[PDB]
Design a protein around this ligand. Structure first.
Ligand code: 98Z
Ligand code: 98Z
Ligand code: 98Z
Lengths: 291, 291, 291, 291, 291, 291
């Protein structure tokens, strides 16, 4: 990284300035999962980027997933699953495991990585300070939508308390569990919870780290990768995409329709993807705006 | 509770007033473990008492343990232990389990119980916002003090950040894990961590919930239960007590010598023990002051 | 008070918690007169209860009367009265006496009693900082309503200045005198002034200390004492009650219709009546709500 | 006042500017008694001057007396006095009268006069919010100093609470009564209480309204009126002056020695004496500084 | 100024009080030019009056002109002018000169004069902190309105930033230059800029220092000088006045129609004209109100 | 700038993070002159870098020179100079010119350039709000140090007011003129004024833009350019350097000895020199630390 002439290091730094202005003082929600979360080099870069944002006076909020880690813990504990469609039923037992893996293991790693740069990160769920609630969701399994246990969608968000915590300079690292109106804690899909947090906080950008270059119109035609797309066009192509992309795309729609200026699907396999998507025009992600 | 004449309900309420004045605006650290934590009726009463304090403008801080729950999880996961003396060696594997049980299971239950009364509780470890650090401790096993893995004593405490969180009206529920100066997370004995938090925050009282009526000079002589005792006298009798009481008593000494006006050993088997110790002179606990 | 088992002292304390939550941070206006004001034991209990409220983060405002003390001072000064109906005409001379007795004697005693518990109470009239104004009221004497001198109803209240003084932690002790729009000070009936203060400050409760168990439908039928009643029903029975109860009931109507959630007529002959009405369900008072 | 050329109205206004700068944002304690308090034209001018100060961002504090009004009330009430030396013994009965006359009559008139210009004045004694305490004083009667009842000197002053009330824009009008360390209210000489308030608040000036042109070295030699004098010189001539001037001069000494930059003895028989002493060099008063 | 009896110095000071109340805490914009700006004695008096206002808790804002000083500098620099009608075309060269004379010479003198009394004045243009913008204005020259270069009218004003600077206790001294929406700096007529600042800041008064006794209906009939006039009447006589008075009168109309309670045309040849217009009823100026 | 692989744009951005942390919330004083100030491309880059810093929550303070522009204006005005040694005597006439060129021309250009990115810059001298004072300096001309008119060194700095203006988010652009203790304005060398501002504000870095690669031990030996040097070593080589470097080096010594962690001499001929010196390790400047 040293053979690079310094007059060019200068220019890439200077070229960040219009995005520094656009995001100064603003909320950016980042959904973090996939290989950016399981590879050690990408993890440390991700944590360093959160520290970066925060040392620019930008206000990151991290929502994390952890599907595979829950599955591994359930097998270690010998807890046999029930499955309707392709969905595990989350019994009270499974939720306790989900909660202790998400909040007590996965969240901790990111909190510690970020905090290597300063006292920034703090972990939380909807349970803490009543920051958000859940409502039980059913799923559609080849016809009759059905019940699959303590699985929810975000209900209400304590917008005021959340922004107080951010204005105080903290980086909330959110584990997606929250109580319903009766105090019963549900597990919430992390992609959609990111969308709901972004909308409630008036975020400027939703960033969705995913394990793909970006959105493909006609996968796997290479000459079909899009750079930008509107929600209306993104509605009419939703029924066509691979299973893995549906939650990430529904999140971007639910956010951008909800007033978030842009949602982005970026590649988490790229080192410092966040820095390149926010401060560079050479990003590989795809940007969703309204229309 | 209705056959009680109302002129007497009045008097017990009025008799709380001098302790309301003494504790208004003040920090009270409560170590919470034992049967007050495992029995459902005592749990709900404990949570309701934390809500009480907080609706009197008193500032509770809860430090919780969970030794037995860690042990059960380790057996469920089939993780065989190593033991020096009577101490389990906490390998990196054991700490990950300890942390996920303490923060992701035991802390969650108390947060949810308290939050049934309002948005008060928030869970945290030393990892969050760098609130406190640990330093590795060795243990003395019948002679040569020795190493037993990632087990620590509290090092430094971010007093300012902690009191900000309390002045904001929150009830921190602390899980005793914290990073050392190198970012490596240790498990801290909860009794001694309570003592260190109390001293750092300038608490007015340390409350230590324990499964005994109180301190016995000469157990099991009944006519030996003390009501109050000074630290100097409490130093010279320390080498004489049952194994279970040593950490609770060392905590009270380390706190009261450190400037906390009084530490109390109260019985957690009593419903609403906190209310009776703080707002009543008919408490069964034993109070430690300096001298 | 010591032969009472401690597990029962606990329960009556715990049973206060839902009213602590309901009133935390809220304004409670208390009209204080009668035998709770002239008996020494009831006085000290009343003052101690105001200190209690204030050490729970509740915000009491005390409005006091003093009819009989004015009369005694007038006789001591040999000032002969004029009477239309049953009403003394308050000449400029009588008002100067009323003001100096109410503010300079009766208010002082309560300020001093309360302040024995801390720097809480501060005395005031509408004259101070222009906190409220009066408008001259006429009275109805068996037909033609007529003039009886410098006697008023509360006009406007400086809501902002009043709540600043309360948020500062003070317990205003109000003597009901205020200037009209021309600077001429009037004496205001204390019961109705309490109602107007409660409505202006957005109080949660109006407490009216009176020398009776509570409201009787058909006095003196014992089996006619009510526990709760709505304003509409309380309008249609108003023309039926003893002379002494009319101002206390008109106050509760004017307050509850004005948005105060509940007004209460409680017995000031009961030691710590305030504590039992606020923090106990075994109260003897009668509660007025809208409907 | 109209035949005066306007170029000269201009100059006297401009000539106030260096005292506006000196006193902007500062505390001025004014002892107010005598004929400035009993003549209606001088009263209204005094009140208007307090409003003036306050509309210049200056912070007046008024301490008032009222000796003669107490005496008249005692005679109206037929309360016979006891006298040691020339001093009335203030029994509990006399104090109740003193307090109700000072706070409930004399203070009220000034509060109302000032408040004709805005919501500025608020009345208070040491009893309110524990603003100051008294300590019982004995007197020297031709030899053996002796006890004369509930008469005190100011003990401690709640400097913080007092300046909060002033920074809030209020003009405290102080009646000199305060409780001792046991809650027993004493009457304090107003001249000396003014001196103690001035010293406690870090006032810039003490103003002492008195019924004389100013200090005379050798009364009644006309060519003996002084314009300025230091405390050391003012100590050595104290044993020589008329009885009426001793309390006013002891006040100025106790204040200026206590750090108040200057104390002034001005003539309260002069309309707007305060304005002329503060904003004009043509004052008739006498100024005391240290040395 | 000493042969004046002191009882009369008192009365003129006391007679200022109702204007102190009216303007306490309020914004007063002062247009300053003409002989009050070029004569040394009038300059120092003007600066002293700004200090006066500020030491009364009044908030002056000074807008200054400087037409003749620009002309002299242009001749010193040998820059030949172009003239359409009677108007100099302000080329880029002329504006650089105008800006450096207005901000770098004329503004500096007033800043320094005022600051002799304290740290009050601070100089600024629309360029600083984007405090206001300009829009290019054309002029009407005996028919076809035409372009005369970089000359503007005030466009938008950063009301919030301006009042922050004033609430901080500063006296802004404004040089009328500001950028247009494209960053190109224009010179703004000072009289009309004063009117726009007054309206944007919600000033209580606009003061326009001019070199005349006041407005004459039928100049030069002496018996035609007016003391007060409404905007409607001031519209219909505008087409009749001398060239020099049109900008001063258009300013007063644009301000008073814009909600400023009164605009005043006062004589800047009078020492301390500001003090006499604000704090005296013997002013020679003419007051404009709406109607 | 597009043929650069994006994984490398990422790394140079990520490599800025440790200097973002070091300077977040801190003061950086930048002396700005020379060719970075006269070339249009370097000007716009400089202004953009100030906007950059400010959108990272860093607090730049710009001190500017302008020697050559003063000289040109003096010749345009035909003002003949007097010279002792190589120094122009600054008469009152020369200072008025210096002040109007520095504040009214050179400062304006930078204010406008920076403000193209937002409302950040505000121009000021020591005259404004009494922000700093000067003391007359003499010079040493081949022996006898002598007087050269109204030329000064910075005396006192209003540290509090200056940091208020910066905490408010403003970028002060300072023109080095200030009054002495008698109100007489002096011109201050900009290099040394930068050093004094840096020391007074507790800056983290002093940046000195100069027209050279950096400090040469033995100019013009190329193999003599230093990267870092301590003050003690920088004292003993000071008597050896070219005339142009002495003020820049004396500034760095006076700053670093005064507690500023590092002063830097960087090349203003390099586009975005500020960005490369602060956020890159490939800088060409030379850093001065204490020792
Ligand atoms: N709200 C909230 C919080 C939950 N955990 C925390 C740790 C430090 C500061 C704040 C919070
Ligand atoms: N407002 C008001 C007050 C009237 N008297 C007082 C005494 C202490 C504090 C505040 C006030
Ligand atoms: N806004 C603004 C300012 C422009 N110059 C200033 C000098 C001192 C304080 C504030 C400002």
């Amino acid at each position: 990284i040293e053979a690079l002439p310094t007059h060019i290091k200068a220019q890439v730094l200077a070229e960040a300035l219009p995005w520094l202005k656009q995001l100064h003082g603003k909320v950016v929600v980042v959904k973090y999962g996939g290989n950016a979360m399981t590879d050690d080099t990408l993890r440390r870069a991700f944590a360093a980027d959160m520290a970066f944002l925060r040392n620019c006076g930008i206000h990151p909020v991290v929502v994390h997933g952890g599907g595979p880690q829950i599955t591994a813990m359930l097998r270690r504990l010998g807890i046999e699953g029930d499955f309707k469609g392709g969905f595990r039923v989350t019994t009270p037992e499974v939720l306790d495991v989900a909660r202790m893996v998400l909040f007590g293991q996965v969240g901790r790693e990111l909190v510690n990585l970020i905090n290597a740069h300063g006292p920034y990160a703090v972990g939380i769920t909807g349970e803490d300070a009543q920051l958000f609630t859940a409502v039980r969701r059913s799923v559609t399994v080849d016809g009759v939508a059905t019940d699959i246990g303590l699985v929810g969608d975000v209900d209400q968000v304590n917008t005021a308390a959340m922004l107080d915590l951010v204005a105080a300079g903290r980086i909330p690292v959110v584990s997606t569990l929250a109580p319903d109106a009766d105090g019963v804690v549900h597990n919430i899909n992390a992609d959609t919870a990111a969308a709901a947090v972004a909308e409630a906080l008036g975020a400027e950008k939703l960033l969705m780290l995913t394990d793909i270059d970006g959105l493909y119109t006609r996968w796997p035609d290479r000459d079909s990768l899009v750079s930008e797309i509107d929600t209306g066009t993104l509605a009419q192509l939703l029924p066509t995409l691979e299973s893995g992309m549906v939650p990430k795309v529904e999140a971007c729609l639910r956010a951008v329709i909800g007033g978030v200026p842009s949602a982005h699907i970026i590649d988490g396999r790229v080192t410092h993807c966040v820095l390149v998507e926010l401060f560079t025009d050479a990003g590989t992600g795809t940007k969703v705006v309204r229309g």
